[PDB]
Amino acid sequence: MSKVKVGIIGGSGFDDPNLFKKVGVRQVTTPFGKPSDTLVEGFVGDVACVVLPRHGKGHLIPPSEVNYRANVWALKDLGCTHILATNACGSLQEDLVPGDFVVLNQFMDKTWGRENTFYGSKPDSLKGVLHMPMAEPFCERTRQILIQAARNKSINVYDKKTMDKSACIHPCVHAEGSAVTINGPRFSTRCESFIHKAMGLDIVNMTLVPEVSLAREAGLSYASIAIVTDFDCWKSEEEHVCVDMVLEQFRKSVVHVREILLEAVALIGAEDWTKTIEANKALVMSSRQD
Amino acid sequence: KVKVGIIGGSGFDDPNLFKKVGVRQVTTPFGKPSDTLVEGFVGDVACVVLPRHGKGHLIPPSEVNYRANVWALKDLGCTHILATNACGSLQEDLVPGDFVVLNQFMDKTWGRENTFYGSKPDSLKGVLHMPMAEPFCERTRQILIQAARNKSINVYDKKTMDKSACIHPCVHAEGSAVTINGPRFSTRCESFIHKAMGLDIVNMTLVPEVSLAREAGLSYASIAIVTDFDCWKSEEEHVCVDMVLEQFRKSVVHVREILLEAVALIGAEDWTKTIEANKALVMSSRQDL
Amino acid sequence: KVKVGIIGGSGFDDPNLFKKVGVRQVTTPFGKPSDTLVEGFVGDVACVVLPRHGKGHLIPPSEVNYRANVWALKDLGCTHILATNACGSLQEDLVPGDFVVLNQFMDKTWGRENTFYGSKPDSLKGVLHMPMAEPFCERTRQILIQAARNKSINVYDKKTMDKSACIHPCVHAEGSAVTINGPRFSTRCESFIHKAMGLDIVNMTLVPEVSLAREAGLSYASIAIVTVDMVLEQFRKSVVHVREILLEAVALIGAEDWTKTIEANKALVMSSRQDLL
Ligand SMILES: Nc1ncnc2[nH]cnc12
Ligand SMILES: Nc1ncnc2[nH]cnc12
């Protein structure tokens, strides 16, 4: 007890997943404030796991007002070594269809006003200046776990660099992808959606950043599964994103999301992470510029 | 019945549109509006006028209380908001003296309060995710364009008309705006990049005003006033405040004409269904419910 | 005459540019500066030094009080600010050990106090919309470039020289920076997009320092340093070159008359006051 342990952050359409029988419910505080909700601990098989809804169980907290620092820190505090996160998103690409999933490997950040670092010279932060490399922002091993889990659960995986497009059979998990994270709470204009598309981005979401950055700052291995619920608004009027559209597609996909997450947890449990964890901690220390 | 709010930007902080009924100070749950409001009538149509920046222009674009301004107009019972925004052209065919009835934007503002809803005490309870694919009221945009036609001002529609048929000064029937935070103008580097993205104009005051109007269930449309070519051309043509004001002055008369004709045209129609649909859109965007 | 302020970024957290003469710990209407300002002379030219990040580099780019730093310099009587910035390259021709006298930027910062003027209780009353088409002081840029030449450092200008003249290490005579908020570095995706926009370098501290300098009626120019043990040593060498360039630059500034330019800097601030219409 207790390394390794998997934190799971649930977004839209995934506010109150019943992933396992609750063992403990933790009301915690962090040096950066309260988490979105109480943290629920238990087991998937023999693997310690902790579940946390990003927006509160009642989804009363908008993406821009989520205390990403407290959520990640609380997970760290409870002994998590990994975080798996879900993120509802819209597709900016023809090959990414509602019902698909994307194991993101890249992002472009257009958020603001969100506390995005544990470190600084304000009293509300830890002392120091952390300049973390983010060139490939996710934990690669954990990404591959998510993909291998999809395969273990007989869900199609599409890998651009190894398969031709005819092998892109829906619904499928895309083995790579880039996300633009917008601040919200409004969805994009068509003008924004076309610009994002022209930039080469795969999907658009509101919740990926700064969660992914803070996980790394926290010395944790993080990976996102993005649930494609819509085509944003670059296609026809009938295909223009709204809350109803996002929710309806998510409820159709939740079963697969649950399956991937539970299998991913087991697979993380079947491996040693001593060196990777050590390298996570080390990357943090080497990143100190103070 | 219909009641039209008019929000006035740079070069239009004393619109003097009609002859005043009275001046009125209001309070909102989101703070004080930019100034008192002038209430009156255009013909038989109730109209309310609010300068965005205060009558002395002491409030910069990034510090304008757009929530309070928009909520104040809702609270006076406005069904529509017509806005003006001074802007720079990033394109050859949009020249100073022209107007643009915007249909799209790209948002580069930050630090502004851009929603009425949240989980903080200074906001309404709820998580509201408005669709914004086509962010204006289309009926109201078309009324602004018709108003221009009716006041014998040239209308240019790049969808039905060739570039050689562009006669200035003209109202462009569509256009997209990048809204920057201010208060500084753009670098040449920034202007070239916005231009490369395919944006038509640059301004500082469209967003979040347009988004809040939709959140408030109001029909909103903007007329952009081209006062300069930003800074993508030669040095003599690089935007500064004096250039902005000098051109805005020359264009104001046309701006006034369109707005007043627009107010009349809105009042001549029934908006019962549109208003219901406006209200329903808000309700359907509540994810917390 | 003139007085040259120097804002030292990474590598210049605690410089020894001249014999310390005066020490000034000030308080501005916009808060405290990053650290004490150090007074002195380069030859006959009055000079002031201030480390952007503070002596311990405790202060992250996004929490630097740029307003206080610039205002403090203005208050001490500075007419010029020369600034250094450590940066990453986005283009093949810009390599570690190179330098760039910037002439352009694209701003991606947010959350920073970026203007002296506004309606908030602690801003200067007024609305200021400064032109920023060419946001540096051009005479001052050319002084930096000349300073590089006077210290025998290669100068490369892609607009007037063949690629063959790009001999490293070199001062690139023009260049554009994207200024990101930090403190994290860019993802590959972000860098790809910035590069595709045509940006030359990426940094975290240029904006709003350059904007504020202009609002203050000061002449500002920036010398960027393009940046394991061989990288550290290279950066140590870069700092030595920049130190030399700035010293020569202060001398070169003091040798010229700046009456009209200073006047015109001041007139640009007044003509940008929209509230004074
Ligand atoms: N199109 C979209 N943009 C942003 N966040 C989203 N979440 C789901 N769909 C989205
Ligand atoms: N070029 C410009 N940029 C931003 N706001 C403006 N308002 C008028 N011209 C402008």
Author numbering:
A (entry chain B): 1 to 290
B (entry chain A): 3 to 291
C (entry chain C): 3 to 229, 243 to 292
Sentences copied from the publication:
Because the S. mansoni genome does not codify an adenosine phosphorylase, one alternative to fulfilling this activity is 5´-deoxy-5´-methylthioadenosine phosphorylase (E.C. 2.4.2.28) (MTAP). This enzyme catalyzes the reversible phosphorolysis of 5´-deoxy-5´-methylthioadenosine (MTA) to free adenine and 5´-deoxy-5´-methythioribose-1-phosphate (MTR1P). The observed overall fold of SmMTAP is similar to that of members from NP-1 family of low-molecular weight purine nucleoside phosphorylases (PNP), which consist of a central β-sheet distorted barrel surrounded by α-helices, as observed in other MTAPs from human and bacteria. Furthermore, a comparison of the KM levels reveals that S. mansoni MTAP can use adenosine with the same efficiency as MTA, which is one fundamental difference between S. mansoni and its host and reveals a potential target for schistosomiasis drug development.
The SmMTAP-adenine complex is the most common structure obtained (23 of the 66 monomers). Further, adenine was identified in the SmMTAP active site after crystallization and structural solution and was probably acquired from the bacterial source. In other complexes, adenine was present in only two subunits of the trimer. The subunits without adenine preferentially assume the conformation of the APO structure (open conformation) of the gate loop (residues 231–242) and part of the helix 5 (residues 240–252). The adenine molecule or adenine moiety of MTA forms three H-bonds within residues D230 (2) and D232 (1) and one H-bond with a water molecule, which is anchored by the side chain of residues D232 and S118. Despite these exceptions, the MTAP-adenine complex, which is the region near D230, assumes a conformation in which D230 points toward the adenine molecule. The glycerol that was found in RBS in some structures with adenine came from the cryoprotection solution. The carbon atoms of glycerol lie in the same position of C3', C4' and C5' in the ribose moiety of nucleoside. The glycerol forms four H-bonds: one with residue S12, one with adenine N9 and two with the water molecules present in RBS. Catalysis of nucleosides by nucleoside phosphorylases in the absence of phosphate was observed for bovine uridine phosphorylase, where the enzyme produces a free base and a glycal as products of catalysis, and for calf spleen purine nucleoside phosphorylase. This could be the reason for our failure to obtain adenosine or MTA complexes for wt SmMTAP, for which we only observed adenine in the active site, even when using ammonium sulphate in crystallization conditions.
